[PDB]
Design a protein around this ligand. Structure first.
Ligand SMILES: [Ca+2]
Ligand SMILES: [Ca+2]
Ligand SMILES: [Ca+2]
Length: 844
């Protein structure tokens, strides 16, 4: 059966997952929608309390101890494993978060992380009334959390005593708990708080302190711990704890505030945010809350693109994924070691490490954050942690991956944000070091670091360097090496990117040397990995030179990366396999060719993940845009659309848009079904086919939650809106038209020192502006096209070239900004954080 005719998912949950009725802001594509939203939110008292939310907090609101593993599709209820139960704590600072969390205990109970797990609670609160320490039961139906705070209601069994907790971690790692205490009777209530982080201080003091070496002694923190009563008096130290007795009048609440500053010398605002709350102007619970939540939400305005499609279920997953990219990051500014840079992390609630395979994948989205430090820091961190090879090169290496495209992803980031020659040259140099290290890696003593054991211009691996790579399951080939299409595409992509970065820097000699290396790898991929017998790109076994008979989407990375020449009839036929769900299904979105997996009686896992969806989307994108896949009917616009819908659907626990959670992976292994395909047997084909029917389901969600393992928001910016980053001053749009979508917008990209927005509004009726496909640069209309088309705009010349066979009618805006920089004309100044990554100086 064909992919073009598989069913769509059916989203469940809220009617208004983008909370459209909570945001009255009219869209003007010439300005930041999130800025205007924020302005209207503040006018409406956003941040004054937990009943007045900023829009992004409303969207990503999680209420209750929900969900619990009960979902529904169009046919009926299904059980699933791996509900998160709204038990993790979202609120976190740039370095501090809860690795584990006990939501039904006051304070911050669970494994506190400062970069990584400390095995310590942040702080606990004991409530003593009537002479007794009280059990405060959470009413979990009142549990509410957002990216910026957590709140719940705690009550004694007899309901004589209630505490509304509001807790939040500030940007610079102050862990704060507001407790609103109410008694039905006049009472003296003694609160005691204790922190494993800070227990040093004289009885009668108003602060406790400590010093804690973090995991792997990467730094030392100097925690300070204090609290105040509603009248601003401080809690007093007693026995290495803080204590206060409230004189409660019946039915009269009093609000206290506890703060633990996880203070680092290298983060001076950690001290400032703490001191403001200890004795400064943020002592009051309400002011402390409004400052933290406002600051949290300002980051979205400043960093996140705004994406709007006709499918608000996808839009909410896009907001959730900007949050995944922000939440799964470390910005600790640690001196010496690599965490001196803002870096993407592969699952802060999981393995919590920098994995080179996924680092390059994450930067496909983080490059779209408006500030370049949130992508540059990731590739600088890879360059700083690179492993010295026996041959004298430095190659990217996990800082606890069979492969990586960090240099290409870094180059993509530079094509978005730019920078001077020293930035371009640094990326090229770490890139060239890595490519050369891999080419020469036959000299690596660890066999898994040896990626070129026949010493040619192709990457080779054995299955020990790993991924669902069914190619390695070929009978008779256990432990054998093959020259890899994927490894070779990624090394080519790095080499090609390094050549481009050398050129952008002005380093002609190194640009030509890397171009020569790229040209050789490309020639060897097209000559050695092209199976002319069946017009497929295949891995090649080192021992006999035989093509690997079994296939995965990894076979197509030479297309994904643009290694393969275009306009080659034979090369373009390789993508025919994407026609068939039997070969490469849309959902579940597997890496392994499923016909191949079946031919071998199902070796490996039945798992699927965003790590499979991202490269599948990359193949679909390159396939459609460059290798004629939609013209051939191999990968149609409708199929691309269906994959976006399935990818969004997978994010939702039980298909319910209230409960987004990107697990490390999914499967249907526990999907209790019969012979659904009618082949005589109950195997994984049955579980997987059933899961794609009746609106979809995922019966197993893995134990690592709110993680990233690949990422997909780039599809909205680059395929739907069509943005093609370039080194030069020209803006290229190459949209993949989504059938039935009469509007969309990507708002407030930061691209070559310009605000950029893209609008599709078929007849202008949705946004009330120009009809058609419009680009905004610098707050002015650049151009409007009557249709979605492949357009290259030269702002310096005021020309738009129509590159496709559309008869697209384009008009250039009367006030178009002409002076759009090329990437290598962007400079950084002392007021850009990115300057501190490389250096009050400028980077020119
Ligand atoms: Ca929408
Ligand atoms: Ca090789
Ligand atoms: Ca069957």
């Amino acid at each position: 059966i064909k992919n073009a005719d598989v069913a769509y998912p059916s989203f469940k949950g809220s009617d208004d997952p983008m909370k459209t009725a909570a945001n009255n802001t009219t869209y003007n594509p010439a300005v930041s929608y999130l800025q205007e939203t924020f302005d209207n939110d503040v006018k409406n008292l956003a941040g004054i309390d937990t009943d007045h939310d900023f829009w992004i907090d409303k969207i990503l609101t999680r209420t209750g101890a929900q969900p619990t593993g009960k979902g529904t599709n169009d046919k009926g209820a299904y059980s699933y494993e791996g509900s998160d139960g709204n038990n993790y704590l979202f609120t976190r600072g740039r370095a501090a978060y809860m690795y584990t969390h006990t939501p039904n205990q006051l304070g911050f109970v669970g494994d506190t992380a400062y970069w990584d797990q400390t095995s310590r609670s942040g702080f606990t609160v004991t409530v003593n009334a009537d002479g007794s320490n009280q059990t405060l039961n959470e009413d979990a139906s009142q549990r509410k959390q957002t990216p910026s705070y957590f709140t719940s209601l705690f009550q004694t069994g007899g309901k004589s005593l209630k505490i509304k907790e509001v807790k939040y971690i500030t940007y610079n790692n102050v862990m704060v708990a507001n407790l609103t205490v109410e008694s039905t009777q006049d009472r003296d209530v003694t609160l005691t708080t204790a922190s494993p982080f800070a227990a040093e201080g004289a009885d009668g003091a108003t602060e406790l302190t400590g010093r804690v070496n973090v995991k792997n002694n990467l730094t030392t923190i100097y925690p300070r711990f204090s609290a105040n009563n509603q009248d601003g008096s401080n809690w007093i130290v007693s026995g290495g704890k803080l204590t206060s007795t409230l004189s409660l009048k019946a039915n009269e609440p009093q609000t206290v505030k506890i703060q633990l500053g996880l203070i680092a010398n290298e983060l001076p605002d950690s001290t400032k945010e703490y001191e403001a709350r200890y004795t400064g102007d943020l002592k009051d619970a309400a002011a402390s809350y409004k400052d933290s939540v406002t600051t949290y939400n300002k980051w979205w305005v400043d960093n996140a693109p705004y994406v709007d499609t006709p499918e608000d279920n996808i839009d909410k997953t896009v907001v959730y994924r900007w949050w995944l990219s922000r939440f799964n990051m470390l910005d600790a500014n640690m001196p010496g070691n690599t965490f001196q840079y803002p870096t993407s992390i592969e699952g802060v609630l999981g393995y919590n490490n920098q994995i080179v395979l996924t680092s390059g994948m994450f930067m496909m989205d983080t490059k779209w954050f408006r500030n370049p430090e949130y992508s540059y820091g990731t590739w600088l961190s890879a360059g700083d942690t690179a492993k010295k090879s026996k041959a004298g090169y430095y190659y990217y290496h996990d800082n606890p991956s069979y492969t990586q495209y960090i240099t290409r992803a870094g180059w993509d980031s530079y094509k978005v944000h730019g920078g001077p020659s020293t930035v371009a040259e640094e990326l090229a140099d770490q890139g060239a070091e890595d490519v050369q290290g891999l080419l020469a890696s036959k000299s690596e003593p660890d066999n898994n670091d040896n990626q070129n054991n026949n010493d040619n211009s192709l990457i080779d691996w054995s299955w020990w360097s790993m991924a669902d790579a069914v190619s390695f399951s070929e009978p008779g080939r256990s432990g054998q090496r093959m020259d890899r299409a994927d490894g070779s595409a990624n090394m080519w992509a790095n080499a090609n990117a390094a050549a481009q970065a050398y050129k952008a820097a002005g380093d002609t000699a190194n640009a030509e040397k890397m171009q020569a290396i790229a040209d050789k790898i490309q020639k060897e991929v097209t000559t050695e990995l092209w199976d002319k017998s069946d017009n497929l790109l295949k891995h090649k076994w080192l021992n006999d030179g035989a093509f690997a008979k079994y296939k995965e989407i990894n076979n197509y990375y030479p297309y994904s990366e643009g290694l393969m020449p275009t306009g080659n009839e034979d090369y373009n036929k390789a993508l025919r396999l994407f026609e068939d769900s039997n070969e490469f299904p849309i959902f579940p979105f597997f890496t392994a060719n499923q016909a191949d997996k079946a031919a071998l009686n199902f070796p490996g896992s039945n798992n699927f993940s965003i790590i499979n969806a991202q490269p599948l989307l990359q193949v679909y994108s390159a396939g459609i845009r460059n290798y004629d896949a939609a013209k051939n009917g191999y990968i149609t616009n409708e199929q691309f659309k269906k994959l976006l819908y399935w990818v969004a659907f997978a994010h939702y626990q039980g298909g319910d848009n209230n409960y987004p959670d990107q697990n490390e992976f999914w499967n249907e292994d526990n999907n209790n079904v019969g012979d659904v395909n009618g082949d005589g047997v109950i195997n994984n084909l049955d579980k997987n086919l059933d899961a794609a029917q009746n609106g979809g389901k995922i019966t197993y969600r893995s134990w690592i939650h709110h993680t990233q393992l690949g990422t997909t928001n780039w599809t909205m910016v680059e395929d739907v809106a069509g943005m093609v980053p370039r080194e030069d001053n020209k803006i290229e749009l190459n949209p993949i038209e989504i059938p039935g979508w009469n509007y969309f917008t990507v708002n407030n990209l930061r691209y070559h020192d310009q605000d950029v927005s893209i609008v599709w509004d078929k007849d202008g009726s949705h946004y009330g502006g120009p009809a058609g496909y419009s680009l905004y640069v610098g707050g002015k209309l650049a151009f409007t096209s009557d249709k979605l088309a492949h357009l290259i705009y030269d702002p310096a010349a005021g020309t738009v070239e129509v590159k496709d066979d559309s008869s697209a009618q384009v008009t250039v805006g009367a006030e178009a900004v002409k002076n759009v920089k090329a990437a290598n004309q962007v400079t950084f100044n002392a007021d850009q954080r990115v300057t501190d990554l490389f250096a009050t100086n400028v980077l020119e």
